[PDB]
Amino acid sequence: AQNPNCNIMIFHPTKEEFNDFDKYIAYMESQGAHRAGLAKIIPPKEWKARETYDNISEILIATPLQQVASGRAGVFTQYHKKKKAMTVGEYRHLANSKKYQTPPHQNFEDLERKYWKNRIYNSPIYGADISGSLFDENTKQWNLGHLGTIQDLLEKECGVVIEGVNTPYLYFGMWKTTFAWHTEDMDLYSINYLHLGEPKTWYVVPPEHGQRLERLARELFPGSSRGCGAFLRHKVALISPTVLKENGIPFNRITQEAGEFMVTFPYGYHAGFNHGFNCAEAINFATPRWIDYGKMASQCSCGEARVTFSMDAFVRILQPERYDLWKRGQD
Numbered sequence: 001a002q003n004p005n006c007n008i009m010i011f012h013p014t015k016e017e018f019n020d021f022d023k024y025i026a027y028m029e030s031q032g033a034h035r036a037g038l039a040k041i042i043p044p045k046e047w048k049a050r051e052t053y054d055n056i057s058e059i060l061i062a063t064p065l066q067q068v069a070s071g072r073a074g075v076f077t078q079y080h081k082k083k084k085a086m087t088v089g090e091y092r093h094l095a096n097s098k099k100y101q102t103p104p105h106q107n108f109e110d111l112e113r114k115y116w117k118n119r120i121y122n123s124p125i126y127g128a129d130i131s132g133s134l135f136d137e138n139t140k141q142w143n144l145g146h147l148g149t150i151q152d153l154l155e156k157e158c159g160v161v162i163e164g165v166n167t168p169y170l171y172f173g174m175w176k177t178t179f180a181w182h183t184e185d186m187d188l189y190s191i192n193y194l195h196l197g198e199p200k201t202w203y204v205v206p207p208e209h210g211q212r213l214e215r216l217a218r219e220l221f222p223g224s225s226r227g228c229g230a231f232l233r234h235k236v237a238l239i240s241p242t243v244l245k246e247n248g249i250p251f252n253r254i255t256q257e258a259g260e261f262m263v264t265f266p267y268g269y270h271a272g273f274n275h276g277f278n279c280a281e282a283i284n285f286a287t288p289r290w291i292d293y294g295k296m297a298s299q300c301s302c303g304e305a306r307v308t309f310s311m312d313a314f315v316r317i318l319q320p321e322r323y324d325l326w327k328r329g330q331d
């Protein structure tokens with residue numbers, strides 16, 4: 001069995017290998033990459049996402065989110081307070097201001113230490129889940145807005161024909177902006193490209209050990225666990241690496257830099273934070289190996305998780321027994 005320790009693998013495809021997306025995912029899986037839950041892909045040196053970023057300040061962040069924390073430094077939840085709209089220009093200036101800027105630090109390890117120590121005492125502002133793309137239409141390889149759709153995957157594998165569309169989202173981050181422990185909707189894959197700016201640190205639990213994380217989360221957030229049998233779907237809970245190590249939860253960590261892709265694999269729990277002002281683009285996708293994870297994915301039916309239009313058909317086709325209850329949660 002390849003990669004039995006479930007280490008995060010890093011890949012360096014050639015320009016030739018970068019032509020066929022699906023083929024390269026299948027290659028990474030042949031090497032055991034999926035066992036980690038996350039992989040890094042460094043594009044060939046000849047590739048570019050777009051020519052320049054010179055005009056990105058005119059993008060609108062319609063609903064910036066202030067991420068307010070409650071708990072202790074290593075075990076906390078965050079709620080999103082909606083703020084008034086601002087342009088990317090305005091947001092970048094805010095990120096770089098004395099109140100919000102990255103503190104002086106020696107290296108990534110020191111910054112990680114400062115994050116876990118001090119995150120809860122600040123409320124950074126995140127621009128999330130903004131429909132759009134920053135890939136040039138002429139970028140033909142690994143363009144996140146030109147992937148084959150999840151609907152077409154399910155049609156090809158299973159023969160059914162469903163509504164729904166699948167488009168990318170932009171994320172604008174600053175120091176301490178935080179993504180909580182989660183898997184993807186319907187335990188899909190995700191792919192994330194860091195377009196510009198400062199790094200993003202990721203933590204991941206191997207898919208084969210995801211239920212270990214869920215058990216700890218039930219222990220650490222006991223009121224939340226009574227409210228919902230899949231409350232990590234709410235995307236609000238943080239658990240530090242120190243706490244994970246104390247409770248024997250297997251995980252790995254890696255820092256993504258501008259110009260690099262990360263892939264999350266089905267049922268790979270992940271969490272992380274941004275080092276300073278940055279812009280990422282991400283999208284969900286499917287392969288034939290996903291279908292069995294889609295069929296088994298947990299669902300939030302308490303009403304909190306509320307998700308896209310396109311998830312309806314996935315639940316309806318793959319999880320018909322659950323459909324009625326899940327849709328009462330949506331409606």
Ligand SMILES: O=C(O)CNC(=O)C(=O)O
Nearest residue numbers: 171179190191192280282
């Ligand atoms: O970049 C972020 O804030 C969050 N991204 C993801 O969880 C992802 O790409 O799967």
Ligand SMILES: [Mg+2]
Nearest residue numbers: 055056058059
């Ligand atoms: Mg612009």
Ligand code: NI
Nearest residue numbers: 183184190264
């Ligand atoms: Ni994700």
Ligand SMILES: [Zn+2]
Nearest residue numbers: 228300302304
């Ligand atoms: Zn719920």
